[PDB]
Amino acid sequence: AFIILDEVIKVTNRRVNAIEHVIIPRTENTIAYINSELDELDREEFYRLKK
Amino acid sequence: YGAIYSVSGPVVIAENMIGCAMYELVKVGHDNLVGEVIRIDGDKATIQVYEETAGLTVGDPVLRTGKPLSVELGPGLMETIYDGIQRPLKAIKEESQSIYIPRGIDTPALDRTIKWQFTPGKFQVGDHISGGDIYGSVFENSLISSHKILLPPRSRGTITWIAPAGEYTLDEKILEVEFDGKKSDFTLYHTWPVRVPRPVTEKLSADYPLLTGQRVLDALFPCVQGGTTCIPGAFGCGKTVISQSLSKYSNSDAIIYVGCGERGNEMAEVLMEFPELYTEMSGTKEPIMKRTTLVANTSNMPVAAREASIYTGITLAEYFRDQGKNVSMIADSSSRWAEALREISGRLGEMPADQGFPAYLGAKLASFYERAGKAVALGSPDRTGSVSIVAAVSPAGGDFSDPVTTATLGITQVFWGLDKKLAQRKHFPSINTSVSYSKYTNVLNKFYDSNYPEFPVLRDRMKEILSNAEELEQVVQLVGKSALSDSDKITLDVATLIKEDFLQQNGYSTYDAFCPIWKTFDMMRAFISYHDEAQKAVANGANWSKLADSTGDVKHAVSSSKFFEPSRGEKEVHGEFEKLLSTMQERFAESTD
Amino acid sequence: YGAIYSVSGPVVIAENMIGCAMYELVKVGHDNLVGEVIRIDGDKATIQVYEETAGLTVGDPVLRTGKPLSVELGPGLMETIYDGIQRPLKAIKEESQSIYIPRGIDTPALDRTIKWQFTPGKFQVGDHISGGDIYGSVFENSLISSHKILLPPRSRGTITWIAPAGEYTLDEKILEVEFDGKKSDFTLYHTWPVRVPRPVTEKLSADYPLLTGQRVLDALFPCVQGGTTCIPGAFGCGKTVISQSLSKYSNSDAIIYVGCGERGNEMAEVLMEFPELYTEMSGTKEPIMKRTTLVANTSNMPVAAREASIYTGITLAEYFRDQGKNVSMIADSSSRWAEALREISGRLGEMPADQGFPAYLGAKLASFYERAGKAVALGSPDRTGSVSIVAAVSPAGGDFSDPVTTATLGITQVFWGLDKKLAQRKHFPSINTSVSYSKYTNVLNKFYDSNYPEFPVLRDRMKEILSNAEELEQVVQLVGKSALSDSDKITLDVATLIKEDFLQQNGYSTYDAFCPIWKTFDMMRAFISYHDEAQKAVANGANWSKLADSTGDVKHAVSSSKFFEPSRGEKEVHGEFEKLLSTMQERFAESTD
Amino acid sequence: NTVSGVNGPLVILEKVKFPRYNEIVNLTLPDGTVRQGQVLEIRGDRAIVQVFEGTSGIDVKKTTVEFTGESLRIPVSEDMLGRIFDGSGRPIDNGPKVFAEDYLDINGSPINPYARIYPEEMISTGVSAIDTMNSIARGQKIPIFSASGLPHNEIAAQICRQAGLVRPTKDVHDGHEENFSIVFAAMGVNLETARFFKQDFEENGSLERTSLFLNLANDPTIERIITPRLALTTAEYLAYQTERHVLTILTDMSSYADALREVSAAREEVPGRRGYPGYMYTDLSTIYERAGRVEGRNGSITQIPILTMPNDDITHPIPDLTGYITEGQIFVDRQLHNKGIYPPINVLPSLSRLMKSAIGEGMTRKDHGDVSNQLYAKYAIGKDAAAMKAVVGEEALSIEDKLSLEFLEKFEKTFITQGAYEDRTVFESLDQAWSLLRIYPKEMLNRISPKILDEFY
């Protein structure tokens, strides 16, 4: 049981550290990039609509 | 002068433009509503209105005020609440019986119900005068006058007529200037545009060693008069308690409170809570209200008063800096003025930008931080002045990554964070060294270290000790306390006592809202000497329980020394902290042997 | 003609103008600035002036050229540096006293002070002639005639006058065509519009392989002469090193360098480095500069030369392809011409598209990419030619979802990717199997397998190894190195070593940038046989660290083969790969046991 | 005639069509103030020009017009070094006179003296990470890319303050054959930053050889955007007249991009994406077009601009459009500055397109390019090995990841660490970089020649 918990603790810590380390920045950058592209497209549409 | 040609939306168009500039503000119609001509297109002028346009028909008269939209500088400014457009709420409460500005009602920019006594300065008949020179003195309070009567900037001449001493109103004249014949009449109140910066003698770097009344904030970073610093907020997450505690606990000559886009609940609590507080400047005459200037504009007001509120407060702080005194300008926040600029730009017809912000917000954000600063006072006297700008930041687009806080963080040279758990813990402010930085601590530690400072060595070892204890707290929490070094427990124990005694402050007494620099330097030097003596005693062979149990009343006595009076050594030095080094050296020598 | 009534920015309006074609070029004012008539509004024509205006006053006359802007097609184009508007920088350097073309200067697209040697070809007196026939030749290169004298397109008749052998000027007639009487006199140069494609006999499928001298380019995805390729760049791909190595190490007889808004220093570095270099075809007396035609544009240069630089380079590539010689068209870059078209669309005041670019950029890019390609040369001889168009693109806001990159990559059939991780390690260019593809490698694999080794099996095995190593890098990075076998470590290490040695094509000399197909085929076959023998040796019982550490100098010897010169062995085939394959086969038996 | 109206910073006045493009005109107001500007738009019976003084307060029918008849030109002389002036070229900041012996007009280039050869001489700034990883030439430009929260003024003040002591040691190495000059133009900066840069320039001892251009955010954007063209024209005229390599610093780039991006909604032009105009590439390329070799073969112009991002994102038109025009860039990472290494400029995304032409055999070592490329690949391999080793831990760490993380930590803590005034040579940085790069094996190093590897490990 001690070898089983010591064997599972490294996989849990490595999976939590890898997922927590690699999880946030891709969608965190892509959401702001897509929102900035949508806002730039909306401002480019309104600027052409005002003329 | 002009006639109303057409009205479309919230902006009214007035024709008959035969010389009216696009910078002067005028009142359209018989109601005298607030408005300003932002642009002109041919004979018809386009004027933006910051109020309801109900009751305005085609053919109404338009009369200009004869000058741009700015604030008036005169005596009797303390203990009064006005708006950004020179609208006093006290006259509206007396006449209209309301707080908000009503439609079709106009009030004066200066209160004509209170008069002050004007005294002659060092200017005689036929003496030379210039812009910024001290022409006399005007009483602004019942205890001490701080309103210095000076001439307008960018002007000069000879004083042909000087009035005598006595009480007079702001509308009446007291002096006359002769420059190329009959130049004009001079009074107590002067005009100054809010969109134009006040002139000065010469600008310099912020190196004035002035304190703001923050023990943990002054201990973590050296406060200077004339610098630029931004503080993050959450719309009432602890910024109002830090601004009210910083303004009330401050010991400056003047205080500038600017409410641009507040909800209105903190404005009444700051005005009613300001007179109940006790100032630390040797006086009890309503010093919290009389010693500070209150300009509060709520969310139910026009965008011109909220946008021009920071310009009027920065213009009043520039006039107080030009008078020869250091004033602290605390404005919350720039997000309401940045949203009001995009709201006025969308209604006026301006094009959009990135993140929904206008293109003028980048130049106005740099001009707002460049308007305040420490330099030489303008005029023949050459006095020393300073203006500290404290602007709050909040989200206005749906997140904290907007261009206002991003451009304000890059433009500013000092950052002060604010943790929500520390604000919930009754600690104000809850900023840490790992979430804040400042590059102006070299000049403040150079001059304040030049007088009698020890802030540099205790500040660097205190920031490194807090950064080492903050990193050691996660290793002590995750790994445990049965496998770490003994120096990490002494560093975390000294960081917990220094963070509890320094960061823990909510205005419980008069000694907790105003601490001297020598008491904070001796308090940090006692903790640094206790941590260094504990690490040196533990390095030579010793137990942690022998030193912690060996300290005893010294550790609890060192934390309870902030509730007493600071007059222990001569008038401001702590005498108990000086004698603690002998007991710490005797305990360190006894713990080693 | 007309008179300039309004001139604001890069758009000029001239009333009382006749003609006003959409593609007609004319010079307005007395300065003779470069311009083009874009559209017309009523009786006035709106002309877009791309040259710098530094005193061009409104009220002067406008002289229309009466035809579209184009360049001269004849002798004297190689060994010369010109702009996009056909401006000689050599005569403008001494005459104008400046290295760059200044405003308010006139210069033709062909030299009038040089003479060329006329040689009679197969076209004699009495025989019929047509457009595109080789009536003569000019001695330009030591191996073949680069500048061949040809007739203009859309012409026919009989040659009544044949000039003899000797030198002649470009202003004297040496040929006469008789077609219903005296038609006209012919010169050495020929006129052709840049806004119109050159005629041809018929189009054919590209089946001629075009070598570029790159191990990563030819090893990654094979391409033949007459195709289109798009490369998304971020200022890290090394377009200057790929243009100089593609022009010097290329197998084409002509090179067309077009500058679409470069810094100027990269064109001067490749221009000064081109004369000191040695040609691969045994060229002498500046063989790199004599066989290459360079058009140089700047970021602050005129927009007319930047917009007409691709049409002038494609017209020169079509004129050189019509004579029967292979030419390579390198465009750097299409984003500079698309940004100039987007700035012209914003300056014109029309309805633009998303991202600022115009809607005609996709049709102009599809027509420019569709204009190039391999086909039969025009003329009665029916010679074979080819034109390979390689244009790089970059984003305008920091993303790869722009219309220029998507429209250029959508119309093209070859894609050259770019990785920031491989580009960060000094790899110009970084081409992977997931971000690259080419359908012409299968047709080129037959002639490449007939006149060379089996590169098509090594390309599919290298792409299959890189496809498994790409998922193995993310799987080993995400989960860890304790969840994979020893077989994937040899594929990841072999893909990292082959990607590192194959990706780096810049080096620090002339030996790390020019690699033949046999050296890349033997180097890829050595790593493929080493990985295949290491997988079978590790499958029978072995360790990955014992096999990788057991290899030693055998793995570094194959990686160090790129540092050697390409002249070893017989002509291009190095004999070290045969002994390295036998040493890997001998080490494979020792690694198993 | 008279002023028809006013929209934004530009004023639309009605007058005759006698003025030309970029013609200097004067507007007379009824309050006793005169404003000068340049005619940016000329039409029939109307004109659109941007005034350099003020942005509001223009009369409609109470104003007068006066035609100057001269084009806009900046007066440059051989004595501009050692004076203080504003963004409009006026001596009102207590500096020297604005008089000049020569007057040349500007339309994008004074004479168009572009270089026709690659730059061979290398200019050292006094940083082993900056000069070693990016070989700056006499005509090549390399800007500093920073973020909101990093000391860009301390890095630019340290780079400008380093010039004066490393230049005499580099002059003996054949890296420079003439005197060096400095051209400082401030735009959109605070008074503490300009006073700190002037205090560092006066404390360094280069006050008489440098130029002072002060532009604030409270002034007009037309004068702030026109100040870098006059500063680059005066630096190019002084470098062309004196035959000396001048280094120009253009900071901040966000204020110059915000000045041209400010007037985008008060005109008849359609702006591009992100609110900026569609002609921002020509304005950004106009500053880079005045860089390179000068006439005579003894003078050059160096461009070292400071770019501060207003949002902290790498996907922006100012950093991508400004960095795409120049050759390479120097990126400053917040992770390196947060640890304590000074400066925080990392060499991971940094590169130089003209690093091979800047290095030779008389002013630098021949193996500096192989050690710079091997150290650049070992820095990214050590960063990827440290990032994979941080997530993976010590249960699946590779053998090469420990030496790559050790060489990345020793190189980041040894080569990246440097004082604000401590001089360092490229020969000692290459010798220390060879000893720091010697910990790797011979089989791993495959990006260098065998003679350079056998000569030195």
- What whole-number distance in Å separates Cα of residue C500 and Cα of residue C430? 9
- What whole-number distance in Å separates Cα of residue B251 and Cα of residue B249? 7
CB burial readout B431-467, b (16+ within 10 A) else e: bbbeebbbebbebbbebbbeeebbbbebbebbbebbe
The phi and psi torsions of B531 (rounded to 5 degrees) equal: -75, -35
Final residue before a domain boundary, out of C167, C186, C205 = C186
Q: Are residues B144 and B15 in the same domain?
A: no
Rounded to 10 degrees, the C-alpha dihedral B438/B443/B448/B451 comes to 170
Q: How far is CA D63 from CA B333, D30, D49, in A?
A: 39, 6, 15
Residue D271 contacts A, CB cutoff 8 Å: yes
- What whole-number distance in Å separates Cα of residue B75 and Cα of residue B71? 13
**C-chain residues within 8 Å CB-CB of D22?**
53-55
Residue pair B161/B175 in contact by the 8 Å Cβ criterion: yes
Q: How far is CA D210 from CA D94, D143, D204, D251, D295, in A?
A: 15, 19, 11, 15, 22
Which member of A18, A41, A48 has the closest CB to residue C351? A48
DSSP state string for B146-184: -EEEEPPSS-EEEEEEE--SEEE-SSSEEEEEESSSEEE
Sequence length of chain B is 593
The phi and psi torsions of D133 (rounded to 5 degrees) equal: -80, -25
A18 vs D391: CB contact, 8 Å cut-off?
yes
> Considering only CA atoms, which of C524, C569, C371 is closest in space to residue C433?
C524
Chain center to CA of D38: 26
Which residues, numbered 85 to 144 in chain D, qualify as contacts with chain A under a Cβ-Cβ cut-off of 8 Å?
A: none
Q: Residue C523: which residues within 8 A CB-CB, separation 6 or more?
A: C215, C501, C502, C558, C561, C562, C577
Q: Are residues C361 and C424 in the same domain?
A: yes
Give the number of beta-carbon pairs within 8 Å between A and D: 29
Helix H or strand E segment including D235: helix D221-242
Chain center to CA of C63: 35
Other CB atoms within 10 Å distance of the CB of residue B352: 24
Q: Which tokens go with B139?
A: 């009483």
Strand partners, C390: C229, C330
The phi and psi torsions of C21 (rounded to 5 degrees) equal: -70, 165
Strands in A8-51 per DSSP E: none
Q: Do chains C and B touch (3 or more CB pairs under 8 A)?
A: no
Q: Tell me which amino acid residue B295 is.
A: V
Q: Are residues B177 and B325 in the same domain?
A: no
Number of structural domains in chain C: 4
Alpha-helical segments (H) within D134-220: 152-162, 166-172, 191-204
Final residue before a domain boundary, out of C69, C91, C124 = C69
Q: Residue B501: which residues within 8 A CB-CB, separation 6 or more?
A: B523, B558, B559, B562
Handedness of CA C458, C464, C470, C472 (dihedral sign): negative
- What whole-number distance in Å separates Cα of residue B316 and Cα of residue B72? 9
| Closest chain A residue to the Cα of D272, Cα to Cα | A44
Alpha-helical segments (H) within C323-440: 334-348, 361-371, 403-411, 420-424
**C-chain residues within 8 Å CB-CB of A48?**
351-352
D190 vs B370: CB contact, 8 Å cut-off?
yes
C156-162 and C175-178 beta bridge pairing: antiparallel
Q: Are residues B258 and B351 in the same domain?
A: yes
* Structure determination technique employed: cryo-EM
DSSP 3-state of D405: helix
Residue D48 contacts C, CB cutoff 8 Å: yes
Range of the domain at C124: 114-186
C478 vs A51: CB contact, 8 Å cut-off?
no
CB burial readout B56-89, b (16+ within 10 A) else e: beeebebebeeebbbbbbbbbbbbbbbbbbbbbb
Q: Are residues B78 and B203 in the same domain?
A: yes
Residue pair D2/D61 in contact by the 8 Å Cβ criterion: yes
Q: Are residues C91 and C177 in the same domain?
A: no
The phi and psi torsions of C262 (rounded to 5 degrees) equal: -75, 175
Q: Are residues B411 and B501 in the same domain?
A: no
C299 vs D323: CB contact, 8 Å cut-off?
no
Q: Are residues B452 and B430 in the same domain?
A: no
DSSP 3-state of C357: coil
Q: What is the DSSP letter of B573?
A: -
Strand partners, D49: D11, D39
- For residue D42, give how far its alpha carbon lies from the nearest alpha carbon of chain A (Å): 21
The phi and psi torsions of C278 (rounded to 5 degrees) equal: -110, 140
- What whole-number distance in Å separates Cα of residue B160 and Cα of residue B179? 9
- What whole-number distance in Å separates Cα of residue B277 and Cα of residue B287? 8
Q: Are residues C531 and C427 in the same domain?
A: no
Other CB atoms within 10 Å distance of the CB of residue D330: 27
C351 vs A41: CB contact, 8 Å cut-off?
no
Kindly list the partner chains of chain B, i.e. chains with 3 or more CB atom pairs below 8 Å.
Answer: A, D
> Considering only CA atoms, which of C309, C296, C253, C257 is closest in space to residue C90?
C296
Handedness of CA D278, D281, D282, D286 (dihedral sign): positive
Residue D266 contacts A, CB cutoff 8 Å: no
DSSP 3-state of B218: helix
The phi and psi torsions of B134 (rounded to 5 degrees) equal: -80, 110
DSSP 3-state of C370: helix
- List the end-to-end C-alpha distance of chain B, in Å, as a whole number: 94
Chain center to CA of C454: 28
Sequence length of chain D is 457
Final residue before a domain boundary, out of B423, B438, B453 = B438
Q: Which long-range contacts (CB under 8 A, 24 or more apart) does D314-317 make?
A: D314/C398, D315/A33, D315/A36, D315/C397, D315/C398, D315/C399, D316/C397, D316/C398, D316/D274, D317/C396, D317/C397, D317/C398, D317/D272, D317/D273, D317/D274, D317/D276, D317/D280
DSSP 3-state of B117: strand
Strand partners, C392: C231
Q: Are residues C553 and C590 in the same domain?
A: yes
B351 vs A32: CB contact, 8 Å cut-off?
no
Alpha-helical segments (H) within C504-552: 517-539, 544-551
Sequence length of chain C is 593
Residue pair D146/D307 in contact by the 8 Å Cβ criterion: yes
Kindly list the partner chains of chain D, i.e. chains with 3 or more CB atom pairs below 8 Å.
Answer: A, B, C
SS3 content of chain B, % helix, strand, coil (to 5): 35, 25, 40
Other CB atoms within 10 Å distance of the CB of residue C243: 25
C426 vs D351: CB contact, 8 Å cut-off?
yes
Q: Which tokens go with D274?
A: 């992100």
Q: Tell me which amino acid residue B208 is.
A: Y
Residue pair C538/C236 in contact by the 8 Å Cβ criterion: no
Q: How far is CA B90 from CA B94, B97, B357, C188, C483, in A?
A: 6, 9, 35, 93, 76
Q: Tell me which amino acid residue D449 is.
A: S
Kindly list the partner chains of chain C, i.e. chains with 3 or more CB atom pairs below 8 Å.
Answer: A, D
Resolution in A: 6.8
Q: Are residues C424 and C457 in the same domain?
A: no
Q: Are residues C305 and C378 in the same domain?
A: yes
Q: Which tokens go with B494?
A: 């000294």
CB burial readout B313-346, b (16+ within 10 A) else e: bbbbbbbbbbbbbbbbbbbbbbbbbbbbbbebbe
